[PDB]
């Protein structure tokens, strides 16, 4: 019932697949060495077309410009919905009704809504009726397209930051040295790690370090959209909210994703 506008100035990047090796050093710095970087919001999403990065302005300075990089023109603010549940029918859909582009980034901890800075006024106009808008200033709150269904099984994950160096080599090998789709989402936000990778990749990492669901529950995907950097999300989040289905959305530069549980994969497909 309370919506927070976080203090992150996020620039959405799109690293081409052949150009990953040029960005390995800053990406390694952000991923595995938090003490060596001032960034507080990182999100890397492996997609077959290209790699999508959601790093704030402080961490953006560490990424050197190159011919293999496409950067979003605008600056994206991070909106987080607190509890003091179902944000698809209360955030994404009303914003779509007002024609505002969003880049969802759901983590194992919480779901983030990214909106453009130029559209902040429209966001405040739309979401004031249902949510009490708050702004995180100085560390304290301040009041203000066809679908595809790849057959691979995915699993959201989290990692203890003290355990990340132990599995660092496997993570580097998976990220940089590697019907069915290839998808790997990494997000280190405010010290919280959220990893979404295929079940086949899960065999490489130790089972004790990965900590999710206590039962091996696996998710299914419903990639969608097209054309790089909203519809890409309203076209799926809206219908899923109308069907009242909980989903794990991961937006990218050119395409949108919505992880759903394996049991409800058929229902999600039928809804669209």
């Amino acid at each position: 019932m309370e919506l927070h506008i976080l203090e992150h100035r996020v620039r959405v990047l799109s690293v081409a697949r052949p150009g990953l090796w040029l960005y390995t050093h800053p990406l390694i710095k952000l991923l595995f060495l938090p003490r060596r970087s001032r960034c507080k919001f990182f999100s890397l999403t492996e997609t077959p077309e290209d790699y999508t990065l959601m790093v704030d302005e402080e961490g953006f300075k560490e990424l050197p410009p190159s011919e293999f990089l496409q950067v979003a023109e605008a600056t994206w603010l991070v909106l987080n919905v607190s509890s003091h549940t179902k944000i698809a029918r209360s955030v994404i859909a009303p914003l779509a009704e007002h024609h505002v582009a969003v880049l969802m980034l759901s983590t194992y901890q919480t779901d983030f809504i990214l909106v453009r800075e130029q559209d902040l006024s429209v966001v405040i106009h739309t979401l004031a009726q249902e949510f009490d808008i708050y702004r995180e200033v100085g560390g304290e709150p301040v009041p203000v397209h066809p679908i595809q269904s790849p057959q691979n099984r995915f699993c959201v994950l989290t990692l203890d930051p003290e355990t990340l160096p132990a599995i660092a080599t496997t993570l580097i090998d998976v990220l940089f040295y590697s019907s069915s789709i290839t998808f790997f989402a990494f997000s280190l936000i405010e010290g919280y790690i959220s990893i979404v990778m295929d079940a086949e990749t899960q065999k490489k990492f130790p089972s004790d370090l990965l900590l999710t669901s206590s039962s091996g529950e696996l998710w299914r995907m419903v990639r969608i959209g097209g054309q790089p950097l909203c519809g890409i999300v309203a076209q799926i989040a809206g219908p899923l909210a109308a069907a009242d289905i909980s989903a794990y959305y991961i937006s990218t530069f050119n395409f949108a994703h919505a992880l759903v549980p394996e049991d409800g994969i058929g229902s999600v497909i039928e809804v669209l």
Binding site: T158, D160, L211, T212, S213, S214
Partner: peptide
């Protein structure tokens, strides 16, 4: 005793 979803205690 195991939680519904694994995370730090």
């Amino acid at each position: 005793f195991v939680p519904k979803h694994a995370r730090q205690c």
